[PDB]
Paper text:
We rationalized that replacing the cyclopropane ring and attaching a linker to the sulfonamide moiety of 3 would lead to a short branch addressing sEH-H ligand, whereas functionalization at the indole-N would result in a long branch sEH-H ligand. Based on these results, we modified 3 at both attachment points with a C3-alkyl linker bearing a terminal alkyne group and obtained short branch addressing ligand 4 and long branch addressing ligand 5. For the set of PROTACs harboring PEG linkers, we used commercially available azide-functionalized pomalidomide derivatives (20a–20f) with linker lengths varying from PEG1 to PEG6. Both sEH-H ligands 4 and 5 were treated with 20a–20f under standard CuAAC conditions to obtain the corresponding PROTACs 21a–21f and 22a–22f. To validate the postulated binding modes of short branch vs long branch addressing PROTACs, the two PEG2 exhibiting PROTACs 21b and 22b were cocrystallized with human sEH-H. As predicted, 21b addressed the exit of the short branch of the binding pocket, while 22b addresses the exit of the long branch. Right: 21b and 22b interact with asparagine 335 from the catalytic triad and tyrosine 446 and tyrosine 383. The PEG2-linkers and CRBN ligands were not resolved. All of the compounds exhibited low nanomolar potencies toward human sEH-H (hsEH-H), confirming that the attached linkers were tolerated in the active site of hsEH-H. For the murine isoform, potencies were typically less potent by 1 to 2 orders of magnitude using the short branch exit vector 18a–e and 21a–f, yet still showed strong activity. None of the PROTACs harboring an alkyne linker (18a–e and 19a–e) decreased luminescence compared to DMSO-treated cells at any concentration or incubation time. The same was observed for long branch addressing compounds with PEG1-PEG6 (22a–22f) as well as short branch addressing compounds with PEG1-PEG4 linkers (21a–21d).
Soluble epoxide hydrolase (sEH) is a ubiquitously expressed bifunctional enzyme encoded by the gene EPHX2. The protein harbors two distinct catalytic domains connected by a proline-rich linker. The bifunctional soluble epoxide hydrolase (sEH) represents a promising target for inflammation-related diseases. Proteolysis targeting chimeras (PROTACs) are heterobifunctional molecules that induce the ubiquitinylation and subsequent proteasomal degradation of a protein of interest (POI) by bringing the POI into close proximity with an E3 ligase, such as cereblon (CRBN) or the Von-Hippel-Lindau E3 ligase.
Residue numbers in the entry: 227 to 547
Write the structure that this text describes.
Amino acid sequence: PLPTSCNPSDMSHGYVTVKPRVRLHFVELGSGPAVCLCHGFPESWYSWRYQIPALAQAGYRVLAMDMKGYGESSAPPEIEEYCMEVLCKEMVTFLDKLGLSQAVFIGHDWGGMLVWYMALFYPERVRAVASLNTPFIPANPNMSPLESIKANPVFDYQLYFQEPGVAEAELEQNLSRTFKSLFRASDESVLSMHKVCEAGGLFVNSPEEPSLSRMVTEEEIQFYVQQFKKSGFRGPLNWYRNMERNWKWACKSLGRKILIPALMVTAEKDFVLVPQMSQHMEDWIPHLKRGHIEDCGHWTQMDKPTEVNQILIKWLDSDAR
């Protein structure tokens, strides 16, 4: 039995201008402690559609964002607008304009990376932090990001995403094909993500007309299509084009721990953000709690929504509320 989902037209839609050219969109449901959900690449507030009702029914005020570059949020073209320092400071201003002293931050993928840096640099604004799939790895001030990325074969696609315009052209060519190719269970994968640079793209060796994953409906895919017609993939991809800047900012933390309540949820079949990558996070995050979802790939919220909801609500009730 799938959890209750969300109908976009039935939600409260909010807009906050954090700077003159940057307006952030979100949907809001529920009363209680504020919980801010932060999606990853290339997703939407709607990626949380199975969490938003559940969390509101559990007694939380849910704010599910369109991250900068996505949906109804602003999408400036400049790469540096999407570095973690800029993105984190904009989320602080977002809370300020909403009049929220703090919020729980829950992220997945790139949104998971942003919530860890929020917890690291703005703990006084973060009541508790949870990440789906994305670990918290301290920066190594004697290793370049180029070297780290190049040291792990599963991170090749990240090199492919570097040159502005290249991956955009591939991902924008046929939006249905893009989303139907990406949003698949681990056993339904049509992507190898091996030597994608070498092969000349993500989809060069994937079907022209992919089948629909068991995880999603045609209507759901078409919601994503419509959202990415607004701004396309430049802003989204720009999240990946700040590796050096993000490393330099992360190095300024160095020393400190994250002392707030924290939850790391691993996904057994995410073959990029692998569970093992989270090992020893407790060395830097003394109050860390864990969850683990079996039979679950990269798209955690729609792969195993019931399990996600159970994990988050149990943790929120014990550690955030």
